[PDB]
Ligand binder design. Structure first.
Ligand SMILES: [Cl-]
Ligand SMILES: [Cl-]
Lengths: 69, 70, 69, 68, 68, 67
């Protein structure tokens, strides 16, 4: 399995789609988010990426932290 | 009773109604608040969820801390 | 290569181009960024310089570390 | 969205791949094609870039104008 | 993994070991430190818990700020 | 199957079996089959997209055992 730190920008878009978060793939792509960034995103980054719903963002944050395992 | 961390989004709405805070049901549901979020909500989160009255917000903050010992 | 602390303002523009970041030349030049400033550039500075896209900004922060560290 | 006129040479390569036209990334990269050029390429430019199959080139020309 | 606010006292012990700070397990255990307390510990709490070396304490404070 | 008869899909299955599926596409794209697998050197693996150092040495180790 490809490790997260090597995921490309399309790999990140595929990850979002796998979790039914494709609504954010355009913003993540336009902001050039790849796997070297993904597990290190903070609350303010996700707001800048258009993730605004409180519980929704906390869910994404949780999933992001899990990628560190 | 169900532990807080397993509360669904409807379960959280039920909790708000139990404490006569049903005015915030819609915002909590639209923001997908479930029990895995409740004890970690901070002032700014509550403001984003429409809890703007000062003393009212403080009362909710107290009830959230209480979830840690229920 | 010329040491970074000696880089002129055009030297910083060349570096931006060398990494396909020429879209930021005008802002860096207008703000008078030279080599003596590159080790002091923080996130807020880069945002002031027009680097707003999230992953793109973290890519520039990474390259600055690679250039100087 | 990043405007086309600011696409870098890698951005153009990624665009080619995205449309399964990756066979031409090397030529576009070697010829320093970026977003400032992409929407202005003509038939003869595309031929110089290795895009020789007729219908295939016509499809790229169609996409290049939809970038606008 | 498990959210920090749910961590039991043994869970906090496991976290300390995971960062090679096992010298502080029994003190954290005896003081009944669990996840509900962990992120809110201050300098004087850590000193009360036996975390005395300056840099070593700053390192623990940094990790605490990260689990939160 | 013996290794030197492995098809391109056979090599892909091998990578999958070792949870190295991230290299399926490049190995398939580069037309790697059993007749090539044993003769792959460090620079061939790099050309095939194998950049993690220790991981690459793990693959090289398995390629020898494949013999
Ligand atoms: Cl062609
Ligand atoms: Cl690799």
């Amino acid at each position: 399995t490809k490790p997260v730190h090597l995921w490309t920008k399309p790999d990140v878009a595929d990850w979002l789609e796998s979790l039914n978060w494709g609504e954010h793939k355009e913003a993540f792509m336009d902001n050039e988010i790849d796997g070297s960034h993904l597990p290190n995103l903070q609350k303010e980054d996700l707001i800048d990426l258009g993730v605004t719903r409180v519980g929704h963002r906390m869910n994404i944050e949780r999933a992001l932290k899990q990628l560190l395992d």
